[PDB]
Design a protein around this ligand. Structure first.
Ligand code: X8Z
Ligand code: MG
Ligand code: ZN
Ligand code: ZN
Length: 234
């Protein structure tokens, strides 16, 4: 029942209720002739909403805000970007123009600036060291260490046992490495194990792209990352 990439035209966004007060948002983009889905999160924060990640681009993110207003009807007051790539910060300006306070760690903000990407306004302190966690309203933000990117955060919703792994966690259907241009392959397995150790009670695990699963997505990602690490150049 989870929206798949073939059921969402580029430019459109779907919302999927994972648990009470927790949705994922699903959008798509074309890259090199293939179409990819991308997930973020929406978490109820009292009578407001906390958004995790843009919908991968300005047009998708405007659609995301319109869909949230249509389907949930609560204001998005804050957004957190979980790393510096365009599926996480692309659309920050749209959020900012709609009165959303945008947040990212200093490490994400510096990497976004280096890349020429959009830069969230606010800085999330207390996340610079692997294993650091901070509360952000109804979620905990956790920096597991470098993995898919040096700045990647994961987001845990304690009330719902939902772990948003972002692009550090692969869906099961991905059996070869995705974008690793900014990754720390050497540290990625260790960072995943930090997630396991910190959230062993997680019941829903949402990857940055593709179908949700459980904590099995973690060891699956480790297996894929190690296979890529050991690729043989002949
Ligand atoms: C824009 C995103 C950031 S994680 C990306 O690089 N993706 C999306 C999944 C694969 C890979 C790609 O370049 O296609
Ligand atoms: Mg696997
Ligand atoms: Zn990424
Ligand atoms: Zn991604």
């Amino acid at each position: 029942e989870y929206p798949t990439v073939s059921e969402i035209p580029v430019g459109e966004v779907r919302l999927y209720q994972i648990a009470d007060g927790v949705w994922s948002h699903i959008a798509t983009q074309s890259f090199d002739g293939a179409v990819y889905p991308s997930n973020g999160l929406i978490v109820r924060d009292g009578d407001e909403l906390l958004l995790i990640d843009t919908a991968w681009g300005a047009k998708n993110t405007a659609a995301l805000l319109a869909e949230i207003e249509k389907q949930i009807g609560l204001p998005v007051t804050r957004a957190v970007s979980t790393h510096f790539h365009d599926d996480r910060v692309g659309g920050v300006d749209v959020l900012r123009a709609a009165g959303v306070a945008t947040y990212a760690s200093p490490s994400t903000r510096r990497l976004a600036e280096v890349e020429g990407n959009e830069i969230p306004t606010h800085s999330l302190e207390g996340l610079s060291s692997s294993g650091d966690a901070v509360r952000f309203g109804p979620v905990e933000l956790f920096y597991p260490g470098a993995a898919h990117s040096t700045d990647n955060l994961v987001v845990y919703v304690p009330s719902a046992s939902v772990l948003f792994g972002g692009c550090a966690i692969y869906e099961l259907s991905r059996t070869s490495a995705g974008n690793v241009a900014d990754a720390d392959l050497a540290e990625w397995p260790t960072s995943i194990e930090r997630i396991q150790q910190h959230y062993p009670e997680a019941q829903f695990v949402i990857p940055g792209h593709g179908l949700p699963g459980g904590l099995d997505l973690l060891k699956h990602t480790t297996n894929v990352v190690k296979a890529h690490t050991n690729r043989s150049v002949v």
